[PDB]
Design a protein around this ligand. Structure first.
Ligand SMILES: Nc1ncnc2c1ncn2[C@@H]1O[C@H](COP(=O)(O)OP(=O)(O)OP(=O)(O)O)[C@@H](O)[C@H]1O
Length: 250
C-alpha cells in the first residue's frame, strides 16, 4: 500500500536525468517541502524489490525513502548518490592498487554480510551496480539495484556463479564479489571470449587464471582471497564472514 499522487510534480521538482535502465529512468529531483535533493527511480518482482528495500538500513546501501503511485508509474524516492558507478572509475583509472581495492571490497563485504544476515541475497552484484556516494576519490561505495534480489524462505554473464548457469543462496553473491575483486586488481574480467557459447562454457567449468605477467606481482594473499570466493563448489566457497577475516581484507 503506497501513497497516491495526482501529480508527482506537485511534490517533487524534477531536474536532470541521472541515468536510465532497461525498464527505468532515474531523475534528480528536489523535495519541495524539505528542499533536499533525492533520486527518483521511475518505472512504467518490483514488489519483491520494494519489500527487500524496507528491511534494509546500511551506510553502504542506497536507501528507499518512500514511493508514490501516479498515473500508472511507480516513483521510488531514493537516497541520492553523486559519484557515478564503479564501472566508470575502473575505466578512468585502469585498475586499482591492492590497498584501494581492499578498502572497497571491505565496504562491499560489510554491506552484503549485513544483507545475508537478514536472509537477503542480491544476485546481481557488479561494478555497474556499485555506486559511489561522491565524486571525491575517497568516497564510500554504495550497493544498488535490488531488482533481482531474493529473500530466504523458512543475471550479467561474467559475474554470475557457475551453479546459476547450470540451472536458474548466499554463495551466489560471494562469487560475484570475487570477480569484482579480480577486475579491480588487473583491469579486465576473469572470463573473456569473443564466442558467447565458449564464454558460457568458461564460467560453467569455472576455469580462470591469474595469468602472467599481469598477475606477477599481485600478492599471493590477494590471489588466495580471490580463489576462495571464486570457488567452484558452493559448499567450499567463502562466506562474507570468512572473506572479512582473510588477511587481505583485515
Ligand atoms: N540513488 C541513485 N542516485 C543517483 N543515481 C542513481 C541512483 N540510482 C540509480 N542511479 C543511476 O541510474 C542508473 C539506473 O540504474 P539502476 O541502478 O536502476 O539499474 P538499471 O538496471 O540500470 O535500472 P533498472 O534495474 O531499474 O531497470 C544507475 O546506473 C545510476 O547511474
Amino acid at each position: 500500500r503506497w501513497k497516491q499522487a495526482e501529480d508527482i510534480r506537485d511534490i517533487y521538482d524534477f531536474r536532470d536525468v541521472l541515468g536510465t535502465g532497461a525498464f527505468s529512468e532515474v531523475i534528480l529531483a528536489e523535495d519541495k517541502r524539505t528542499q533536499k535533493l533525492v533520486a527518483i527511480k521511475c518505472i512504467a518482482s518490483m514488489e519483491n524489490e520494494i519489500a527487500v528495500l524496507h528491511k534494509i538500513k546500511h551506510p553502504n546501501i542506497v536507501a528507499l525513502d518512500d514511493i508514490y503511485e501516479s498515473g500508472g508509474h511507480l516513483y521510488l524516492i531514493m537516497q541520492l548518490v553523486s559519484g557515478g558507478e564503479l564501472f566508470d572509475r575502473i575505466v578512468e583509472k585502469g585498475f586499482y592498487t591492492e590497498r584501494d581495492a581492499s578498502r572497497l571490497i571491505f565496504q562491499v563485504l560489510d554491506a552484503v554480510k549485513y544483507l545475508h544476515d537478514l536472509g537477503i541475497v542480491h544476485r546481481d552484484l557488479k561494478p555497474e551496480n556499485l555506486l559511489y556516494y561522491s565524486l571525491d576519490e575517497d568516497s564510500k561505495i554504495m550497493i544498488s539495484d535490488f531488482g533481482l534480489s531474493k529473500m530466504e524462505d523458512p543475471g550479467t554473464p561474467g559475474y554470475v556463479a557457475p551453479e546459476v548457469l547450470a540451472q536458474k543462496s548466499k554463495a551466489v553473491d560471494c562469487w560475484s564479489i570475487g570477480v569484482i575483486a579480480y577486475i579491480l586488481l588487473c583491469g579486465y574480467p576473469p572470463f573473456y571470449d569473443e564466442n558467447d557459447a565458449k564464454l558460457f562454457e568458461q564460467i560453467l567449468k569455472a576455469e580462470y587464471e591469474f595469468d602472467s605477467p599481469y598477475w606477477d606481482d599481485i600478492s599471493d594473499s590477494a590471489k588466495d582471497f580471490i580463489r576462495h570466493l571464486m570457488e567452484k563448489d558452493p559448499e567450499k566457497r567463502f562466506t562474507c564472514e570468512q572473506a572479512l577475516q582473510h588477511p587481505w581484507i583485515a
